[PDB]
Amino acid sequence: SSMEIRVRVEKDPELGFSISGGVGGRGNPFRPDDDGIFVTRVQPEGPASKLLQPGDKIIQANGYSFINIRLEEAERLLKTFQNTVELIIVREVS
Amino acid sequence: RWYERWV
Ligand code: NA
């Protein structure tokens, strides 16, 4: 059971969260057999606080699909975007 | 192990 969430994070100066995972990558601490990109830590007083949560799977960012993406490409895109970034994430619920 | 990258 899960929900899909569309959120806008205003870089100031970064998005304020970390990512793990990726195709051909080293995995993630949330869904071991999923090669997706996962929000891993969120900076507590940063632009993503109260918007994203650890474990959120990023499936789209500024219109780029993050399904089947390499970690390095996800990171470099997210760092290259300017100002407000629109994310679509998937959040699991117990 | 998995690793993380800040953005
Ligand atoms: Na801010």
CSV table of C-alpha atoms and ligand atoms in Angstrom, one decimal:
chain,number,residue,atom,x,y,z
A,1,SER,CA,0.0,0.0,0.0
A,2,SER,CA,1.4,3.3,-1.1
A,3,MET,CA,0.8,6.9,-2.1
A,4,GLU,CA,2.2,9.1,-4.8
A,5,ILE,CA,3.1,12.6,-3.8
A,6,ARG,CA,4.0,15.6,-6.0
A,7,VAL,CA,6.0,18.3,-4.1
A,8,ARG,CA,8.0,21.4,-4.9
A,9,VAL,CA,11.3,21.9,-3.1
A,10,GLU,CA,12.9,25.3,-3.3
A,11,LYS,CA,16.7,24.9,-3.4
A,12,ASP,CA,18.2,27.1,-0.8
A,13,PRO,CA,21.0,26.5,-1.8
A,14,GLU,CA,20.6,22.7,-2.1
A,15,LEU,CA,17.5,20.5,-1.8
A,16,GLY,CA,18.5,19.4,1.7
A,17,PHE,CA,18.2,15.6,1.4
A,18,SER,CA,20.4,12.7,0.4
A,19,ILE,CA,19.7,9.9,-2.1
A,20,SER,CA,20.8,6.3,-2.3
A,21,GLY,CA,20.2,3.5,-4.8
A,22,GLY,CA,20.2,3.5,-8.6
A,23,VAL,CA,20.4,1.0,-11.4
A,24,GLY,CA,23.6,-1.0,-11.1
A,25,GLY,CA,24.1,0.7,-7.7
A,26,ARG,CA,24.7,-0.5,-4.2
A,27,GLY,CA,21.1,-0.7,-3.0
A,28,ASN,CA,19.2,1.2,-0.4
A,29,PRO,CA,18.3,0.7,3.3
A,30,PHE,CA,14.5,0.7,2.7
A,31,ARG,CA,13.7,-1.8,-0.1
A,32,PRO,CA,16.7,-4.1,-0.6
A,33,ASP,CA,15.6,-5.6,-4.0
A,34,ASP,CA,14.5,-2.3,-5.5
A,35,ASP,CA,17.1,-0.4,-7.7
A,36,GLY,CA,15.2,2.9,-7.4
A,37,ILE,CA,16.4,6.2,-6.0
A,38,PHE,CA,15.4,6.7,-2.3
A,39,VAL,CA,15.4,9.8,-0.1
A,40,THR,CA,17.6,8.7,2.7
A,41,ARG,CA,18.3,11.6,5.1
A,42,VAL,CA,16.4,14.9,5.2
A,43,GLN,CA,18.2,17.9,6.7
A,44,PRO,CA,16.0,18.9,9.7
A,45,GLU,CA,15.8,22.7,9.1
A,46,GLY,CA,16.2,22.5,5.3
A,47,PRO,CA,14.1,23.1,2.2
A,48,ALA,CA,12.8,19.5,2.2
A,49,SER,CA,11.8,19.3,5.9
A,50,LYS,CA,8.1,18.4,6.4
A,51,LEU,CA,7.8,17.7,2.7
A,52,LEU,CA,9.9,14.5,2.1
A,53,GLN,CA,10.5,11.6,4.4
A,54,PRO,CA,13.3,9.0,4.5
A,55,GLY,CA,12.2,6.1,2.4
A,56,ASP,CA,10.4,8.1,-0.3
A,57,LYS,CA,11.2,6.7,-3.7
A,58,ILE,CA,11.8,9.5,-6.3
A,59,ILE,CA,10.1,8.5,-9.6
A,60,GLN,CA,10.2,11.9,-11.3
A,61,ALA,CA,12.1,15.1,-11.0
A,62,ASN,CA,11.4,18.2,-13.1
A,63,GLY,CA,9.7,15.9,-15.6
A,64,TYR,CA,12.7,13.5,-15.9
A,65,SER,CA,11.7,9.9,-15.1
A,66,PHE,CA,13.8,8.5,-12.3
A,67,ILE,CA,12.6,5.0,-13.0
A,68,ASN,CA,15.6,2.8,-14.0
A,69,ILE,CA,18.1,5.7,-13.5
A,70,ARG,CA,21.8,5.5,-12.4
A,71,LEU,CA,22.6,7.1,-9.1
A,72,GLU,CA,25.2,9.4,-10.6
A,73,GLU,CA,22.7,10.7,-13.2
A,74,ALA,CA,20.0,11.3,-10.6
A,75,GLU,CA,22.5,13.2,-8.4
A,76,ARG,CA,23.9,15.3,-11.2
A,77,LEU,CA,20.4,16.2,-12.5
A,78,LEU,CA,19.2,17.2,-9.0
A,79,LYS,CA,22.3,19.3,-8.5
A,80,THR,CA,22.0,21.0,-11.9
A,81,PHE,CA,18.4,22.1,-11.5
A,82,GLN,CA,17.9,25.7,-10.3
A,83,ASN,CA,15.5,27.2,-7.9
A,84,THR,CA,12.3,25.1,-7.4
A,85,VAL,CA,12.4,21.4,-8.2
A,86,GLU,CA,9.2,19.4,-8.7
A,87,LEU,CA,9.4,15.9,-7.4
A,88,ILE,CA,7.0,13.0,-7.6
A,89,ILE,CA,7.7,10.4,-5.0
A,90,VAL,CA,6.2,7.1,-3.8
A,91,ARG,CA,5.6,6.7,-0.1
A,92,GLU,CA,4.8,3.3,1.5
A,93,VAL,CA,2.5,2.9,4.4
A,94,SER,CA,2.4,0.0,6.8
B,1,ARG,CA,26.8,-1.3,1.6
B,2,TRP,CA,24.4,1.4,0.2
B,3,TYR,CA,25.7,4.9,0.3
B,4,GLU,CA,24.1,8.3,0.1
B,5,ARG,CA,24.7,11.5,-1.8
B,6,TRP,CA,23.5,14.9,-0.7
B,7,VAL,CA,21.6,17.1,-3.1
C,1,NA,NA,15.1,27.7,3.3
